[PDB]
Write a protein that binds this ligand. Structure first.
Ligand SMILES: CCCCCCCC/C=C\CCCCCCCC(=O)OC[C@H](COP(=O)(O)OCC[N+](C)(C)C)OC(=O)CCCCCCC/C=C\CCCCCCCC
Ligand SMILES: CCCCCCCC/C=C\CCCCCCCC(=O)OC[C@H](COP(=O)(O)OCC[N+](C)(C)C)OC(=O)CCCCCCC/C=C\CCCCCCCC
Ligand SMILES: CCCCCCCC/C=C\CCCCCCCC(=O)OC[C@H](COP(=O)(O)OCC[N+](C)(C)C)OC(=O)CCCCCCC/C=C\CCCCCCCC
Ligand SMILES: *[C@@H]1O[C@H](CO)[C@@H](O[C@@H]2O[C@H](CO)[C@@H](O)[C@H](O)[C@H]2NC(C)=O)[C@H](O)[C@H]1NC(C)=O
Ligand SMILES: *[C@@H]1O[C@H](CO)[C@@H](O)[C@H](O)[C@H]1NC(C)=O
Lengths: 930, 225
């Protein structure tokens, strides 16, 4: 904190992919109300695209938004499968009423009107229909529609007639319609018709004009119609008379409109015949006419300015499927007549390739000259929001990368060396035989530097900072998107897209070669694996510029299971990467001749461990000379009583400064630094509150020996474990007392180390002793990761991620298990605080002040330069970046240095020395002469 | 190693050295300015010079014949002659001398304390030899680190090392036996001890054998030009 807000940290607020959106608002209200797939309901500023009020919800499906509607100034939402219905005041940014509903799957949401004004909400579930007041949400009336145990209701209609229309279907069979009255709710009427060809109503059918039902029938290439006010039997009209046809193997759709719920729908409507094909049809008293046909058009949208309806149609400039250059034009068409608007065409270009727009919501208004001026919010396929305004300058208003809402994995890559430092790595290494040559090159470099000094009298120029405190984050997003974000300013430097990436695919990002090899480009590898198919692929890219490297990745024919980043490097300083396939063969990368020789000579020292959680099995495989694996060790935690939930092993890129610790007494206690120690944490499959338990095994990674096999009784997940140099810390829930608890496991060897020259997992016959202690954490948790420094000199801190959004910096020294229950002289010599079961969450410890990170998912800690600053990236819904100083920034000049005092004392004391020298000389002369 | 901030050199390393150097110069010049010779009356300087003459006589009376020496003895310590027999006789001065003695070290310790406050929380320089861990609490004042190598030192102890290692430089530039560093009242008893000592002294006329030790070698005469 230290009240240096905004100097180093930066937060970005991201909502998810926009599932439902609402643009209709007052022209001066300048608001968008959008609910996303991330369970988030938010308001976006129209002018600049920023969050006004955001309300996150439960991460699970128990809070998913299912339907949005807007009326007047408050937006009405349904969540948890129709369980809760809420009304949000868009101006203030809070609820107006929250009402729970009865069981039954929600199917359709709509409004009703009495005579001229909308005042109630009709919400329909698979077995019932309900009416709720707008003012307070009090239930008006609930009616169980007849025979509903067999039918599936799909839509609800009402208008100023003061009646309610309900429609239900049975697949490939008859459909039914019910007339209710708003005043009472009793079943005014009920009709049934036969629709053998119909499949479902919501996706396919629609209703236009005066409640006229319209189902497009592809079996006969026609438009089945039902004048629902009076007609009792469906009528048929072929599209051949209108010169129209349906596609093959596709479900045509129909898009009606309703400018306000009280008035009847517009007669004109859209028909989606086939993809990239639309029609405008105007029904008029038993017959329909084609208004305008739109071929090769991706998306259409509707809007109302108050009196007239406006249709927006999207298509690229020239088709080349796909599109020529990702340049899409949107044109306005009047709904009264299928005539294109004048000087309303908009044209924009999507930066990426292979991405096409998916959603289009337009907002219209009256210009000064009464011309319909419109803006368009378009969501692309890769979860990107574009706001397009009519005027040519800055055709995109605010481009929002909502994709970064769900980040799976990220790594920090150091920036390239600056120009002023590039030559310091080129002159070195010459190793000239004669000293004269060395002197010549040294003096030449000196003259070059002198000339550069005397001369002093954006991704293009990206350069490393002096402290190496400014890195660039390569981020991977489950939407399949790769980002490069500068860690200092938070801006985006490069974006890339991976085509055809399933939402549930598992990623793994590895930094194969950093920037300390200037003649060679930095190179990172991302490993994606589709869950459904099982096939995995490798994408290698430069993490600085973002372009795919020319080094073609190998084609992984078989599904793979695990990957390793061996510290051995090729001649071009690329860290060898190993993959284990399903046939337990091993594929190397880059797998050159030198790499193959190096890892063949070092083959028997490479071990994989695969943890199959489905069967509750752990296996550990060797590495033979000919790149093959053999069953070295195998353990089985029986899935019938225990399922493996976490396999957190210690980070490979860390160092430990003090091998042992001073115990006082003038003696030393040696830590058990085992680098191959897994920390497999499993939950009890018995979910009962009194018999549940959580096990933690400190399984070795090479010999398979179980160092520790702790089982905590009366506890339940979720469990968040961090594994570090020596200790492990796993937070869990305690069902018996209802309180979150920590449990620190510290591994200590004897008073004398078994071996100091080297550590081998095959030569550790002494089981390290374990020290345990359980503390109480007075809140929940969402993500943990220890702060890591380059040399490990700086003390260790745990970045507790609370649900509130703060990031508590809990000192690891507090969680010491050696804190005695009764203080003694030994403890005072070691300065150990007496054991206190309560751990405080004092608000002054938060590494962030009020930039809360809602629904925190993970904390990444990077060593950075220096020794007191660790870079922190908390990723979740929001993404936040900062630096932490666990040791109060011991190696950096304080920001409150008194320059005007030190310089003043220096230059007022040199003058004092001169004055006192003159005084001493004068006094000496006077004393000599007297 | 440690990637120490470069700005720690331009403002915590060099300024400490400059402060120590010029504070030593200031202290020496203030010391010479403050020193004032105490007023002495005729009797004290007279007796001090008399005992000076007595001591130099005791030291090198060997170049004086025996009769002159024993006449000196009669004059100095003998009832009949009378000399050495009929020759005898919060305060401001104590506070002043105590303050003068105090001002030779205490200003250095006060400067050290001021430096320790002003430059607290840094790591200034690495002492190039492996100091013991038990010396940690005083070398690394203001640092919360635990596993840090003992060879890393904070600002206060670096200033102390500077003030210890700069006295020789002071003697080099300021002048020999300078006052910038870190580190008779009664005549009656003096009269009596001179009496007893010169009673105990003997005579050895060094001229008893000068001729024979001169006759042995010829007189040096070259370089007359
Ligand atoms: C943020 C700028 C440099 C000017 C410093 C002058 C300050 C000064 O006046 O301090 C004089 C000192 C010592 O006097 P001195 O060596 O110049 O003269 C010989 C000493 N005496 C006269 C006793 C024989 O000079 C020095 O140490 C400066 C040389 C180091
Ligand atoms: C404006 C900024 C002030 C300019 C620098 C101040 C000049 C100090 C020079 C000085 O004259 O000071 C040196 C003394 C030497 O020691 P001394 O006791 O032998 O001579 C003193 C004799 N007496 C005790 C009777 C006073 O040491 C000291 O007091 C140094 C005192 C340390 C305090 C640092 C001042 C912090 C800045 C404000
Ligand atoms: C890379 C690290 C090396 C460190 C450098 C220190 C060693 C370099 C030394 C001497 C080379 C200079 C030769 C010039 C001849 C000077 C002596 C001489 O025969 O010529 C006579 C005149 C006046 O004689 P005097 O009464 O003044 O000498 C004092 C008399 N006696 C020695 C009996 C006390 O000399 C004069 O012109 C007055 C000037 C006297 C010499 C001034 C040099 C001292 C200045 C700075 C020394 C260190 C201060 C900064 C270092 C901080 C780092 C911790
Ligand atoms: C989060 O905290 C910061 C820092 O306290 C708040 O920024 C301050 O806002 C007030 C209100 O205008 C200003 O007077 C201060 O000068 C701001 N601080 C600084 C350091 O500039 C910020 O408003 C807080 N966020 C919220 C949502 O309240
Ligand atoms: C394609 O679109 C991009 C937009 O970034 C533009 O820079 C480029 O000139 C376009 N190319 C053509 C041939 O229209």
């Amino acid at each position: 904190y230290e009240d240096q807000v905004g100097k180093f940290d930066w937060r970005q607020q991201y909502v998810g992919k926009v599932k439902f959106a609402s643009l209709e608002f007052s022209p001066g209200s300048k608001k968008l109300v959008v609910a996303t797939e991330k369970n988030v309901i938010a308001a976006l500023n129209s002018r600049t695209g920023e969050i006004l009020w955001r309300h996150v919800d439960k991460g699970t499906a128990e809070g998913a938004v299912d339907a949005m509607l807007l009326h007047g100034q408050d937006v009405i939402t349904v969540s948890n499968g129709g369980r809760i219905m809420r009304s949000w005041e868009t101006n203030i940014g809070g609820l107006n009423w929250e009402i729970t509903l009865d069981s039954g799957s929600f199917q359709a949401l709509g409004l009703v009107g009495l005579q001229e004004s909308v005042r109630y909400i009709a919400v329909l579930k698979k077995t019932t229909l309900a009416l709720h007041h707008l003012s307070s949400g009090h239930l008006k009336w609930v009616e169980h529609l007849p025979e509903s145990d067999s039918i599936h209701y799909q839509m609800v209609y009402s208008y100023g007639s003061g009646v309610v229309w309900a429609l239900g279907v049975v697949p490939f069979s008859h459909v039914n319609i019910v007339k209710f009255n708003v005043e009472d709710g009793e079943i005014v009427q009920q009709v049934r018709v036969s629709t053998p060809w119909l499949q479902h109503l919501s996706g396919a059918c629609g209703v236009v004009d005066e409640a006229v039902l319209v189902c497009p029938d592809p079996s006969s290439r026609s438009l089945q119609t039902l004048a629902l006010e009076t007609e009792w039997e469906l009528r048929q009209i072929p599209l051949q008379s209108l010169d129209l046809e349906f596609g093959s193997g596709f479900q045509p759709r129909v898009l009606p409109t309703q400018p306000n719920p009280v008035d009847a729908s517009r007669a004109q409507f859209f028909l989606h015949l086939s993809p990239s094909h639309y029609a405008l049809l105007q029904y008029h008293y038993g017959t329909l006419s084609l208004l305008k046909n739109f071929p090769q058009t991706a998306l259409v949208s509707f809007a109302t300015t108050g009196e007239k309806t406006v249709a927006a149609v999207m298509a690229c400039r020239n088709e080349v499927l796909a599109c020529f250059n990702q340049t899409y034009t949107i044109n306005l068409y009047l709904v009264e007549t299928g005539r294109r608007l004048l000087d309303t065409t908009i044209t924009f270009s999507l930066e990426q390739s292979g991405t096409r727009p998916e959603r289009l919501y337009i907002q219209v208004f009256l210009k000064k000259d009464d011309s319909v001026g419109y803006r368009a919010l378009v969501q692309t396929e890769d979860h990107l929001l574009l706001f397009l305004q009519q005027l040519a300058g800055k055709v995109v208003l605010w481009s929002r990368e909502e994709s970064l809402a769900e980040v799976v994995c990220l790594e920090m890559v150091d920036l390239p060396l600056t120009g002023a430092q590039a030559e310091l790595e080129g002159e070195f290494g010459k190793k000239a035989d004669g000293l004269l040559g060395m002197f010549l090159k040294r003096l030449s470099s000196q003259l070059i530097l002198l000339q550069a000094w005397t001369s002093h009298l954006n991704i293009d120029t990206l350069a490393r900072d002096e402290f190496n405190l400014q890195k660039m984050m390569v981020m991977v997003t489950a939407s399949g998107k790769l980002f490069g974000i500068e860690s200092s300013s938070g801006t985006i430097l490069w974006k890339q897209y991976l085509p055809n990436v399933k939402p549930d695919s598992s990623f793994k990002l590895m930094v194969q070669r950093t920037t300390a090899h200037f003649p060679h480009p930095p190179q990172c590898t991302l490993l994606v694996k589709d869950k459904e198919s099982g096939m995995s692929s490798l994408y290698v890219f430069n993490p600085i510029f973002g372009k795919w490297s020319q080094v073609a990745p190998p084609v992984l024919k078989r599904p793979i299971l695990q990957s390793l980043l061996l510290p051995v490097m090729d001649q071009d300083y690329a860290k060898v990467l190993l993959l284990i396939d399903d046939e337990y063969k091993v594929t190397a990368f880059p797998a050159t001749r030198n790499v193959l020789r190096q890892l063949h000579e070092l083959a028997p020292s490479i071990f994989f461990y695969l943890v199959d959680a489905e069967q509750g099995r752990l296996c550990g495989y060797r590495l033979r000379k000919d790149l093959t694996t053999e069953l070295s060790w195998e353990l089985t935690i029986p899935p019938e009583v225990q399922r493996i939930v976490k396999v957190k092993g210690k980070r490979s890129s860390e160092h430990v400064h003090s091998q042992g610790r001073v115990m006082g007494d003038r003696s030393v206690l040696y830590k058990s630094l085992n680098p191959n120690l897994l920390a497999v944490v499993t939950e009890s499959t018995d979910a009962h509150h009194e018999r549940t338990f959580i096990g933690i095994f400190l399984i070795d990674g090479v010999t398979g020996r179980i160092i520790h096999s702790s089982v905590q009784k009366k506890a339940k997940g979720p469990v968040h474990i961090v594994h570090s140099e020596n200790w492990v810390v796993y937070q869990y829930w305690n069902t018996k007392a209802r309180r979150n608890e920590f449990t620190v496991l510290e591994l200590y060897e004897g008073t004398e180390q078994y071996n100091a020259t080297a550590f081998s997992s095959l030569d550790r016959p002494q089981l390290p002793q374990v020290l345990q202690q359980s503390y109480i954490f007075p809140s929940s948790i969402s993500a943990m990761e220890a702060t890591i420094t380059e040399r490990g000199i700086t003390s260790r801190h745990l970045l507790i991620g609370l649900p509130s959004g703060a990031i508590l910096s809990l000192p690891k020294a507090l969680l010491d298990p050696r804190r005695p229950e009764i203080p003694t002289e030994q403890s005072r010599e070691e300065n150990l605080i007496p054991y206190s079961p309560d751990v405080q969450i004092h608000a002054e410890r938060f590494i962030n002040y009020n930039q809360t990170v809602s629904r925190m998912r993970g904390i990444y800690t990077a060593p950075s330069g220096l020794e007191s600053t660790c870079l922190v990236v908390a990723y979740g819904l929001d993404i936040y970046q900062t630096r932490v100083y666990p040791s109060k920034q011991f190696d950096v000049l304080k920001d409150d240095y008194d320059y005007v005092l030190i310089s003043s004392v220096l230059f007022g004391l040199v003058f004092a020395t001169m004055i006192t020298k003159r005084l001493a000389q004068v006094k000496l002369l006077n004393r000599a002469w007297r | 190693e440690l990637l120490l901030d470069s700005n720690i050199r331009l403002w915590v390393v060099l300024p400490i050295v400059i402060i120590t150097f010029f504070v030593g110069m200031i202290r020496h010049y203030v010391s010479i300015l403050l020193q004032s010779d105490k007023k002495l009356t005729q009797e004290q300087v007279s007796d001090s010079q008399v005992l000076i003459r007595s001591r130099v006589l005791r030291e090198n009376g060997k170049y004086i014949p025996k009769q002159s020496f024993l006449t000196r003895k009669y004059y100095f310590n003998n009832p009949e002659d009378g000399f050495f027999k009929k020759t005898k006789r919060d305060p401001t001065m104590l506070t002043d001398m105590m303050k003068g003695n105090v001002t030779n070290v205490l200003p250095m310790i006060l400067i050290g304390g001021w430096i320790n406050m002003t430059f607290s929380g840094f790591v200034t320089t690495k002492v190039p030899f492996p100091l013991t861990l038990r010396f940690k609490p005083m070398l690394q004042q203001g640092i919360e680190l635990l596993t840090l190598d003992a060879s890393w030192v904070s600002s206060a102890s670096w200033y102390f090392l500077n003030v210890f290692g700069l006295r020789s430089i002071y003697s080099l530039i300021l002048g020999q036996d300078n006052a910038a560093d870190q580190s008779p009242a009664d005549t009656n008893k003096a009269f009596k001890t001179e009496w007893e000592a010169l009673e105990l002294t003997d005579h050895q006329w060094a001229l008893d054998d000068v001729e024979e030790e001169l006759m042995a070698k010829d007189l040096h005469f070259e370089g007359m030009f």
